[PDB]
Amino acid sequence: AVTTVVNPQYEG
Amino acid sequence: AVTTVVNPQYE
Amino acid sequence: ADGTWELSVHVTDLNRDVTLRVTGEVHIGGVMLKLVEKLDVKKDWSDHALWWEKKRTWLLKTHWTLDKCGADAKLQFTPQHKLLRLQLPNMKYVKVKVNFSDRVFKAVSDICKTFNIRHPEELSLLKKPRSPLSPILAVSQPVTSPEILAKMFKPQALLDKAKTNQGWLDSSRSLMEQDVKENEALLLRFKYYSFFDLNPKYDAIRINQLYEQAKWALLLEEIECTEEEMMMFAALQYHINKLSIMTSENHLTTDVNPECLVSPRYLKKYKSKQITARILEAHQNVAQMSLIEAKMRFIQAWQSLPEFGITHFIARFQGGKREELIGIAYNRLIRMDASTGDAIKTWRFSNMKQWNVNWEIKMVTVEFADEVRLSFICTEVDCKVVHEFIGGYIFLSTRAKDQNESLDEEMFYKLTSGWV
Amino acid sequence: LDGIRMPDGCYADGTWELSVHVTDLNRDVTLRVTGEVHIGGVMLKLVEKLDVKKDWSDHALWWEKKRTWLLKTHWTLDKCGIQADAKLQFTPQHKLLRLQLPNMKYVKVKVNFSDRVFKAVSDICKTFNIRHPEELSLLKKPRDPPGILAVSQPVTSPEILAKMFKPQALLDKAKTNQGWLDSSRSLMEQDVKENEALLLRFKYYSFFDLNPKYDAIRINQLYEQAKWALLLEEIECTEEEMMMFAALQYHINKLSIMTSENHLTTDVNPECLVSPRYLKKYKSKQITARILEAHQNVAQMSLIEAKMRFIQAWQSLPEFGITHFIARFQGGKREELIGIAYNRLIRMDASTGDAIKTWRFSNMKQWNVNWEIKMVTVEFADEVRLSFICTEVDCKVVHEFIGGYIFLSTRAKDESLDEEMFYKLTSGW
């Protein structure tokens, strides 16, 4: 029931 | 009687 | 009587219902061929497919048993391609033939190729409330009679503008699955406010429509600006109209005197009629560039407004008391007060490690570096629109100036679809 | 005075006579001086004899025969080699200088004719609000064989443009380049009359940070230099490019009317450009005036950008940015040209202008000038040395051009020019 998408453009 | 100058931008 | 399992199929092209005998093992390709053998054996059915309205699904996988898909079912034998009425950003209406079974992202891309609009991933379709054909887009007319703008000048609160954003279609579904009947007017709009390689050398029409979306947003107060700024946009638009007039000078109605413009060698070698015609041809492109450059400045001044490029959605934030707004932009999320429009808190995408959507409770939860999670609840409609907006802007930020002339639509779908 | 005999020419008191011409009076004045009187002593002795209420603070002493100013007040007459046979001049240091701007309009400026014309040019450009004066310089008009500064008008009549067209060969154009003033010396030392017009022109074709936001006047004059060089065929181009340059000029001039008529000469404002709340809050005559006021900067910006496109097309021409000088190459059999650009030296044919051989400045290790025989020698790392000979005037000008383009290449977007480095790279004396 959950979707997860891990930011490609994650700098921090 | 000459004037020799070197260019600083040799690359 | 064998195993009569009567199947009623409505053929939208002929407004005629037909009933067939099946066994449940007959294939999708099998029933379609039974349609043509019973109706016009001369008709071109190569564009027809079966659409199951109750399940809101096309039946494109031909080698599928009826049982594999799932008697008493109401199917439609309908053309995949239909006419779509669109309102352009310049507010002119147009009509386009689109495959109503392609995902809207692919549909939008194909519509922008027809219109010579690069980078369609920045555009999408939006629903209205409650016309030439193409395989005008260069018009850019001014707000003519005050009544036209007065009829459109009906203002809207910030909560009401946020309700309009429920109409952004799912880019990963087709036109048919989203309640678009034939000849209904959708809005083609620049959905994302991050314009890649806005190049005046080749994006004349793309720039024209983007300028027209900005123009109408400003004079209809979709986006606010100070009194001084509005005066500058008006003078900028007044200038664009004037520059537009200069591009339309012909052989008649020209003051071009080559004797004051070119070297005397040219005056002596050719007749004026050959010179001036050569000037006027070169002047058309020269005046067109001044027009595009002016629209570009109108777009950049629009871009610099403090409200620019924010799309608002009603949200109930974790630990909040009332309905507020979640603002989505090209680089950040904004928690905003639904009454004053004041930003309350901003989160940068660069600090967003990941986000997730719980489709049961309708909760978007964004995880950050060195910051507690952000959680908010939306309506079921807005939850999917918000998820696509976030994934969409993320997808655009990966676009590289490495001449990456190839949109990975698979990565977009992976970034923007949780299959609800 | 007390020698074996009286010093020759000395009066009974051992003083000797010294003639000084005061240019503001056309009158010579004699002073009885001694060999130990200082330069400041001669000036003060002058100011006593002349009008005592007039301001003599700008006057200095000029020696035409020695082609030098006498600005060292602590120098004695014997230390300057000034005997009784010396004809000096008491003259204003700041004088009036006629200048034809690149737009072909004549102005007159006041400059110290004792400052090195580099510093002069720098001060002239600051008066004109033209940034980067190192890119410009002064050029003597060749002998035939802010208002004005923002004016950009077309040719009045084909007959006017015809009287200016001189169909000169390439050799004649290179001879015009003999009149670039020495940047290391002053106006006076270079035979410039106060009532004679010099050409203020962009000398080097490397324009640092030509910015449409604050270089309007610098852009207009550069554009006007580009327009007139193309009309008068200083530089050549194809027939297609001439029509495009003509269309651009026709376009630029139509924009110029807007930037001059927006005030008053405007009835085209239709007021259908603002939200209805603005029509409801402000009278229609009030919003017209505020749109018109903001339109001046808008219309002006379109005008600069159009001129910017005219410049950019001009810079894209294949012969753009080359300054030609007559030169004899070490193996040649006839007169040829040395072409000087921002990044290269070009051996060129003196009749057609076809490039024969190009040498990159990047490979140039060093260069030198043998002033006695007027030979310029360039050493390279990827090929053998280049050597050529010019006239006496050209030898100095070619040296300043080469050193100038090396100096301009040192400029970075971060910055007070460093005129010391310019003077080192562009001086032989």
Numbering used by the authors:
A (entry chain C): 786 to 797
B (entry chain D): 786 to 796
C (entry chain A): 14 to 83, 86 to 145, 199 to 203, 220 to 336, 513 to 680
D (entry chain B): 3 to 147, 218 to 336, 513 to 662, 665 to 679
The authors write:
Integrins are heterodimeric transmembrane receptors composed of alpha (α) and beta (β) subunits that link extracellular ligands to the actin cytoskeleton through intracellular adaptors. Cytoplasmic adapter proteins including KINDLIN2, Integrin-β1 binding protein 1 (ICAP1) and to a lesser extend FilaminA were shown to bind the Integrin-β1 peptide in the proximity of the K794-containing distal NPXY-motif. Integrin capture by the PH-domain-dependent membrane-associated KINDLIN2 is a key event in the induction of cell adhesion, even prior to TALIN1-association. Structural analysis of Integrin-β1 interaction with KINDLIN2, biochemical pulldown assay, and binding energy determination by using molecular dynamics simulation showed that acetylation of K794 and the K794Q-mutant increased KINDLIN2 binding affinity to the Integrin-β1.
We mutated the Lys794 to glutamine (Gln), an amino acid that was previously used to mimic acetylated Lys-residues of proteins as it provides charge neutralization and shares hydrogen-bonding capacities with the acetyl group. We also determined the crystal structures of Kindlin2 fused to the β1-K794Q peptide at 2.49 Å resolution. The surface representation of Kindlin2 indicated that the β1-K794Q peptide is bound closer to the Kindlin2 F3 subdomain than the wildtype β1 peptide, and that the β1-AcK794 peptide fits the Integrin binding groove of Kindlin2 more snugly than the wildtype peptide. (F) B-factor index for the respective B-factors of the wildtype and K794Q-mutant Integrin sequences demonstrating stabilization of the c-terminal KYEG-peptide sequence by the introduction of the acetyl-mimetic mutation (QYEG). Since B factors represent the atomic displacement and mobility of the side chain, this result further supports the notion that the K794Q mutation in β1 peptide enhances its binding with KINDLIN2. The peptide carrying the acetylation mimetic K794Q mutation also showed enhanced binding of KINDLIN2 compared to the non-modified peptide. but still had less negative dG than the peptide carrying the longer and positively charged arginine residue (K794R). Nonetheless, the biochemical affinity data validated the use of the K794Q mutation as a relevant model to recapitulate the effect of Integrin-β1 acetylation in cells. In the specific experimental case of permanent acetylation mimetism by the constitutive expression of the K794Q-mutant of Integrin-β1, KINDLIN2 is recruited with higher affinity leading to the formation of dysregulated immature adhesion.
